[PDB]
Structure 1
Amino acid sequence: SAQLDLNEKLAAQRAADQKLADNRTALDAARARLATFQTAVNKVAAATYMGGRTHGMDAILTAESPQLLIDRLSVQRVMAHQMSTQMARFKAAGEQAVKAEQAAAKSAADARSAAEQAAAVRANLQ
């Protein structure tokens, strides 16, 4: 009876433990992704330094050939588009440090709640 009321929930307990364990090995992906991303956004102010002088409007302060100044603006306006989308690409990784990372702590708290619940109910046998 009360001894027999054990094995119906060891499967669920092992499932909860493995769902904690693989998510502990899945939470590292977001911090590895930001560890790949943050180096390209930290000293980009030094990347536009050394007299960058190109901003996508004129491209006329230096000139050697008319053909060679076409891509000084035709690529730089796409660069303006990419630095407009760069903030969105940065926030799409920054939201992962705000959203869907407390689920592991919530699962740990739920596992502790299930552990104390299993300790509470088991007084019928013990």
Structure 2
Amino acid sequence: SRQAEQTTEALHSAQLDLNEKLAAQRAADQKLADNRTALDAARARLATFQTAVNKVAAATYMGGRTHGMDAILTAESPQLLIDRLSVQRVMAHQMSTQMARFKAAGEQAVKAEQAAAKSAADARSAAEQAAAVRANLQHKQSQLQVQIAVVKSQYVALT
């Protein structure tokens, strides 16, 4: 009668692996609920900012020739020229800050894309290892049916 009693405690102790697999896929799902959300916000702010950076880039095409010697060419008096440099020097910093913020946002978008790809690979690996936990449970937890089937036949000489 030892052919069935040897695996009695295995059915009781085989809940820990499925519990930790469920916890691992839950942790993967709850990080999955935030990672592409953060990536979508990071790409969406740059998406809203392309329509501003290209507009300020193309804004100098309609007569914004003031970034060098040409700014005195469109000047009529020294009085309107001496105060023009005071706003020209602070305006020339504005698109420099725009290009710096654009490069920073592009680097942040590339980092968010890399993080999203790494998280997708991690979620795929977590799903792949979690599927193997419930793959063999169909024959792991069918031993209780074997125990119930041999419980009736365990009577010696029909009791």
Query: TM-score w.r.t. structure 1 length?
Result: 0.74
Larger displacement relative to structure 2 (73-82 or 104-113): 104-113
Number of corresponding residues: 126
CA RMSD of aligned residues (A): 4.8
Query: Larger radius of gyration, structure 1 or 2?
Result: 2
- Greater relative contact order (CA < 8 Å, ≥ 6 in sequence): 2
Q: Mark the CA change 1:9 to 1:77 in structure 2 (over 3 Å): closer, same or farther.
A: same
Gaps of 5+ in 1: none
Deviation of the 1:20 alpha carbon: 0.6
Identity %: 99
Say whether the 8 Å CA contact 1:56–1:73 is kept in structure 2: no
Greater CA drift, 82-91 or 60-69 = 60-69
8 Å CA contact 2:42, 2:108 repeated in 1: yes
Cα offsets for 1:82-123 (capped at 9, x unmatched): 333332221001112322322222222222222222333456
Unmatched 5+ stretches in structure 2: 1-12, 137-157
Query: Cα 1:68–1:24, aligned 2, differ >3 Å: closer, same or farther?
Result: same
Q: Secondary structure of 2:16's partner?
A: coil
**Paired position in structure 2 for 1:40:** 52
Name 1:72's counterpart in structure 2.
84
Q: CA deviation at 1:57?
A: 5.5
Q: In the alignment, is the contact (CA less than 8 A) between 2:46 and 2:105 conserved in 1? A: yes
